[PDB]
Amino acid sequence: KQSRELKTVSADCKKEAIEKCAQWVVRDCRPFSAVSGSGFIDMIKFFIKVGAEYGEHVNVEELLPSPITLSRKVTSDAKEKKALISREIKSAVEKDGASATIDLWTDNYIKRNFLGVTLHYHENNELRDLILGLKSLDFERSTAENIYKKLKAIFSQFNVEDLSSIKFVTDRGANVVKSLANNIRINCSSHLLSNVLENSFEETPELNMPILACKNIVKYFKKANLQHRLRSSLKSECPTRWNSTYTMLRSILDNWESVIQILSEAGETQRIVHINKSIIQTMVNILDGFERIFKELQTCSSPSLC
Amino acid sequence: MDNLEVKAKINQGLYKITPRHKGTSFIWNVLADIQKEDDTLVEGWVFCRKCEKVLKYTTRQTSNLCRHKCCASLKQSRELKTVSADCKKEAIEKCAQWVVRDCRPFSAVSGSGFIDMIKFFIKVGAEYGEHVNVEELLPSPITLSRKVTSDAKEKKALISREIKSAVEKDGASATIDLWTDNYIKRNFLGVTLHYHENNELRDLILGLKSLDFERSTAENIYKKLKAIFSQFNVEDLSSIKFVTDRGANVVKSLANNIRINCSSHLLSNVLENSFEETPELNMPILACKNIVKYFKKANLQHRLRSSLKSECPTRWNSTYTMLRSILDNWESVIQILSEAGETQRIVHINKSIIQTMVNILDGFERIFKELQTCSSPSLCFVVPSILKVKEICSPDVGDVADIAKLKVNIIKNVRIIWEENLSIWHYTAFFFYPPALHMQQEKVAQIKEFCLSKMEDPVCPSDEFEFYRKEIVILSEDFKVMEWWNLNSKKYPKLSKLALSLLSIPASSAASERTFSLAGNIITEKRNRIGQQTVDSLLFLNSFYKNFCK
DNA sequence: AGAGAACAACAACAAGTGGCTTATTTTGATACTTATGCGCCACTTG
DNA sequence: AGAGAACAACAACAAGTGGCTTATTTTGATACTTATGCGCCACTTG
DNA sequence: CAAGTGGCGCATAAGTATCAAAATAAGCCACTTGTTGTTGTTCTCTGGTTCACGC
DNA sequence: GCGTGAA
Ligand SMILES: [Zn+2]
C-alpha cells in the first residue's frame, strides 16, 4: 500500500475533492464528463506542481488569464505551428504522394459558405491524416474559379505550387469538376452506391408501397406520442442518410409483436398486415450486406482501396 | 527648454491644476496634469503631487512614470505571493491545450466554481507535496450524480423546517406552470416559492417533477403538487397564493384553493386583441413578415448593416424589435427591394405610422420591464400601469384616425378584460402606497372590512388603521416600501406581517419561464438521456446556492 | 657538560594617519517595442 | 462511423469496532565496585 | 610563618549488574453497514439545395 | 433554352 511511489491521500481529501467538483459542476452548468477530460488531468498536474513548489499563499486569481488572451495565444500558436509543419508538408507533397478530399458545406445558422481540406498520406508504417485548413468564400455565390483560387492560396501559404501531382476523391459537382479539370477527379464510392440504391428502389413501386406504409406508420407513431410504451423507440423516417430505412426495418421487425399488439386495438392493424414478413427479412439481409460493405469500405484509418 | 518654461509659469501661478483624470491605473491617483489658460489640456507632460516636478507624458507607454520616487512608496495593496512571467506563460499554455482538446467555450476559465476548485487543488498540493497521484483523486461522473442527488435530498431535509416556518405565518406565494421539452415530448411540472424573512424576498424553486407520460389532467397536477409539498411535510395547501394565467386544467385542479391571474400574459393578450380589431394595421405587419421572410429565404442578411430580428417566437411580442430593426435601417432595405424586383411590397407602409407605433410599443416594453422583476417587489405598480396606458392613448389630431381606432380598441379591451378580472388583493396591494391622495373612493370602504376580517388571526386594529390613513409622505426617488414598514413595524406590530405577505405576491409568474429556460439550457440535443430527478436536483441546488448561500 | 631563569644593546617591525591620481559603481530621466486586461458593445441566436 | 453524454443492473469493495494471544520495552530495585574530591591535620622546612 | 604533600578514611557517586511485575503492538479474524467500479444499453450528430451547361 | 442532376 503506497510502496513509496507517487503518493495517495486520505478519505477526507477525496471527500472534499469530490465536494469541490460537485460544486463546480452544479454551479457552472457544465457536462458531467468534464472531470474525465484528457487535458483536465494535465492541468491538475500543472496546478498541483505549482502549488507544491510555491506554497499555499499565492494569488490564484492572477495566475489564470482572460479568454481574449486565450484567443490571441491560440491564433499565434496556429501561425507558428503552420509555419513549422509547412516544411514537412511540402516534402510530402513533392514526392507525388498526397491525397485530399474536397467538399463544401453551408453553416446552419449564419449560412456562410466554407470549404475544408485534409490530407491522407503514409509517413512510417501508418497513414497520417491532418486537416490543412478551412476557409470561407466570403458571401459571394459559389463558383469554380473562387474554389480554385482559394485552394491554390491555401496550398501556396503551405508552400505548394504544383497542383497536379496531388489526388482528389470528391463528388460530381459540375462546378467542382470544372474547378480541377487539369487533375484527376474520382467519384465518391459511397455517393455512387447511394445513387445505385436510389435507382434500385425507385424502379419497383410495388415494393416501394411497403416502404411508404412503414414511413407513414412511424409518422403515426411520432405524431401521437406512441413510442412511450414501445420497448425500443423508432428512428428518423427519411433523413436521406445512407438508407436509414434499413435501421427502420430492423427496429420495426424487432418490435413487430409489440406494434401488432398495440395496433390490434388501435384500428390501423389492417394496413400493416398487407405485406408478408418474408420479403421484409430478405431485403433486411440485403441491406445487412450493404451495411457491412459500408462499415468496411468507409474507413479513414486503414486501406480500403483494395 | 519647454519643461523648464512650463514649470516656471505654473510655479508663478499662470496655469492651473487638475488632479483627477478618470483612469483605471493607480498612477493617476497621485499624478496630475496641467491645463492652459484657455482651458486646453497639456499634452506630452505631467505633474506630480508630491515632488512638484514636471515629467514627460507618453500615450503609448507609461512604465517610465511609475519608477518615480514619489509614486514608488504608494505602490498598491499587498496581495498574495505572485510568480514570474514564465509560470504564467506555461499556465496559459496548459489552459490553451485544455480549451482546444475538449471543444469547450473560452469563458469557462472565468467561472467561480473553477476558481474554488483551483484554490482547493493548490492548497492540497502545497500541503501534500509535488508527488500526489491525481488520477485516483478525481472521481467519475456517476459518483458526481449520486452525490448531487444525495446532497439535494439532505439540503431539502434541512430547509423544510424553514419552509414550514414561512408557511405558518401565511406567507405562501408560489406560482405553477406547465412546459414541454423539445426532444422527448415529456411534460414537466414546475413550481417556485417566495417568502420574506431577512428584509428582501427569497427567490427559490420548490421543485420540478415530471408527470410521467400519462395524459394531462387536473387530478394528476393536484396529486403531483401534493406530493411535492409532501416531501417537505406540508399539508396546509390552502393559504398558498397561486398565480396562473389561463391554464384550464390547472385552474380546474386548484379551483378550491386561492387563485390569482397573471398580469404579463393578460397584457400580451390585451395587445393581441387591440391589434386584431384593426385590419388596416394588420396587413402592414403581414407585409413586414413577408419582407423578413424574403430576406431570410435567400440569406440576403449579409448586405444589411444591422440584421433583422426574429419574426415571432410567441415570446412576449418580438415584433417590437422586429419593427425597430426594420425602421432604423429603412433606406438600405428599400434600396435592396428596389433592385430585388419586389418594389410593390413597400408601397403599403409609411414611416410616420411606423415611428408612432415604435414610440407606443416602446412604452409598452417599458411597462413590461418595470412590472416583470423577480427580486424587487412589483405588485404595487399595477393600477398606475392602466392609468398610464390610458393617458398615452389620448385621442388627438396629430395621429391618423386609424391610430385613434387602435387606441379605442386598447381602451375597450383593457376595460372589458383587465379590470373586471382584477381581484381585491390587487386593490389591497395598491392601497399601501405611501402617497394615497388619489383614492378615497369605495375601494377603501371595502378594504376596511376586508383587512379587518383577514387580520383576525388600546392597540385597536381600526384605530391604527386610521392612524395609517392620516400619515402621508410623498415619494422619493430611492424609496422602498419593504424597508419602510421594516422601520414602521414597531409602530404597527400586526399590520406589518400583512403588508409583508401582500408584497411577497409577485406581479406575474416569470419565475416559471426563467426555470423552463434554464431547463432548456440544461437539456440540449447532445444531452438527451438526462433524467428528471437529476434535472430537479441540479435546478434546486443552483437556486439554493444563488439564494440562501453566500 | 648539562640545564634553570633574566636582563641588555641594538634592531628589525606594525598600528594608526593624509595626499592622491585614476578608475569604479550608483542614482536617475527617458526612447521604445510587446505581451495582458476591463468594458461596453454589441448582436446574432432561439 | 466516429462523434460526445448517461443511465440501469450486478459485481466489488475499503472503512471501521471487537476479541486477544503473543513479543518486549519502561520502570524499579536491590546489589555491588572504582575513584574522586573535601577537609582537617599533621608535618614538615627555612 | 607558609606553600607545598600524604593520610584517614570518607562520605559520595558515576559506573556496573540481575531479579520481578508490569505496560504495549502484531498478526488474524468478526462482521455490518454504507460505498465504488466496469460494461453494458439508448438517443442524436455529418452526410444536402441551384449553377455550370452541355444536352 | 431547360433540364440535369448531384449535391
Ligand atoms: Zn514626484
Explained architecture:
The PDB classes it as recombination/dna. The entry lists the keywords transposase, transpososome, BED domain, protein-DNA complex, recombination, RECOMBINATION-DNA complex. The structure is cut from a larger assembly and holds two copies of chain A. Chain A is mainly alpha-helical. In chain A, 54% of the residues lie in helices and 9% in strands. Chain A contains twelve helices and eight strands. In chain A, strands 1-7-8 form a three-stranded parallel beta sheet. In chain A, strand 2 and strand 3 form a beta hairpin. In chain A, helix 9 packs across helix 12. The longest helix of chain A is centred in the N-terminal third of the chain and has 28 residues. Chain A is extended. Chain A starts with 10 loop residues before the first helix and ends in a 9-residue tail after the last helix. Chains A and B meet through helix 1, helix 2, helix 3 and helix 4 of A and helix 3, helix 4, helix 5, helix 6 and helix 22 of B. Zinc ion binds next to loops of chain B. The structure holds four DNA strands.
Summary, kept brief:
Chain A is mostly helical and 306 residues long. Chain A has helices at residues 11-28, 38-54, 60-63, 67-94, 144-157, 174-179, 189-202, 205-223, 244-254, 256-264, 269-272, 277-297, and strands spanning 99-100, 102-106, 113-117, 120-122, 127-129, 133-136, 167-170, 186-187. The site of zinc ion has 6 residues of chain B, from loops.
